[PDB]
Amino acid sequence: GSHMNNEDFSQWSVDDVITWCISTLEVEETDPLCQRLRENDIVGDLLPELCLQDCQDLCDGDLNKAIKFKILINKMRDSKLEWKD
Numbered sequence: 001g002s003h004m005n006n007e008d009f010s011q012w013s014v015d016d017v018i019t020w021c022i023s024t025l026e027v028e029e030t031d032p033l034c035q036r037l038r039e040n041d042i043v044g045d046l047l048p049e050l051c052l053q054d055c056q057d058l059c060d061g062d063l064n065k066a067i068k069f070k071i072l073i074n075k076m077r078d079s080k081l082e083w084k085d
Contacts, residue, residue: 002079012044024072026065033059047073 007016018037022029036058042050050058056066 004079004081006079007044009043009045014038014041017042017044017047021069021072025069033065048077 014037018034019029021037022031022033025033027033040054040058042054050070052066052070055069056063058069059065
C-alpha cells in the first residue's frame with residue numbers, strides 16, 4: 001500500500017524532524033522555529049500525537065503555523081509518489 005522505503009519512525013531524530021519540517025513548512029533553517037521544535041523532543045512516531053494542541057503550543061501562537069504543520073505531517077504519513085492524473 002505505502003510500505004516502500006520511508007525513513008523508519010524509529011530512526012527519526014530531532015535534527016531530522018526539524019530540518020525536514022521547516023524546509024517544507026514555511027521558512028528555512030534560520031528562524032527560531034528550530035529552537036522551539038528542538039526543545040520539545042518529539043519523535044516521528046509521536047508527530048501524529050502532537051495534534052493542533054501540541055503543534056500550536058510549539059508556536060508563539062499562529063494558526064497558519066500549526067495548521068500547515070499538522071497537515072504536512074498527514075501527507076508524509078499517507079506518502080505521495082505519483083497517483084495524481
